């Protein structure tokens, strides 16, 4: 009974880790691009 | 919210500077020409 619950837990944790990786990567990229675009606006 | 307000402020200040430059330049020129024309009138 416990073993399958542990397997499901492992799967759900692994899914969450991938979501976190994607979220941080894209958030950092979009923050950098926002910095660049507002810098360009100030230049303009 | 602040950043676009700052950009608009910069633009409006820059416009005012150009207006001031034009105003002083033409005012000095017209004062000089008025001096010259009244001097010529006194000569006449």
Instruction: Give the HSE-up count for residue A14: Cα atoms under 13 Å, Cβ half-sphere.
Output: 6
CA distance A24 to B9: 35
Q: Are B7 and A41 in contact (CB under 8 A)?
A: yes
Other CB atoms within 10 Å distance of the CB of residue A38: 13
Spatial contact of B1 and A36, defined as CB atoms under 8 Å apart: no
For this entry, resolution in Å reads 3.5
Interface test with A, best of B7, B8, B10 (most A CBs within 10 A): B7
Encoded tokens for A39: 């810098």
Which residues of A fall within a CB distance of 8 Å from B13? none
Q: Which residue in this structure is represented by tokens 């633009």?
A: B11
**B7 in contact with chain A, both atoms CB, cutoff 8 A:** yes
Per-residue CA distances from A21 to A10, A33, B18, B42 (Å): 17, 18, 51, 87
Q: How big is chain B by its Cα radius of gyration, in Å?
A: 19
Tokens 């001031």 label which residue? B20
Q: Are A42 and B7 in contact (CB under 8 A)?
A: yes
Please give the angle made by the CA atoms of A38, A39 and A41, to the nearest 5 degrees: 60
């Amino acid at each position: 009974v416990g073993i399958e619950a542990a397997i499901v837990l492992i799967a759900f944790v692994i899914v969450a880790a991938a979501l976190a990786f994607v979220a941080l990567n894209m958030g950092l990229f979009t923050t950098q691009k926002s910095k660049e675009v507002m810098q360009r606006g100030l230049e303009e």
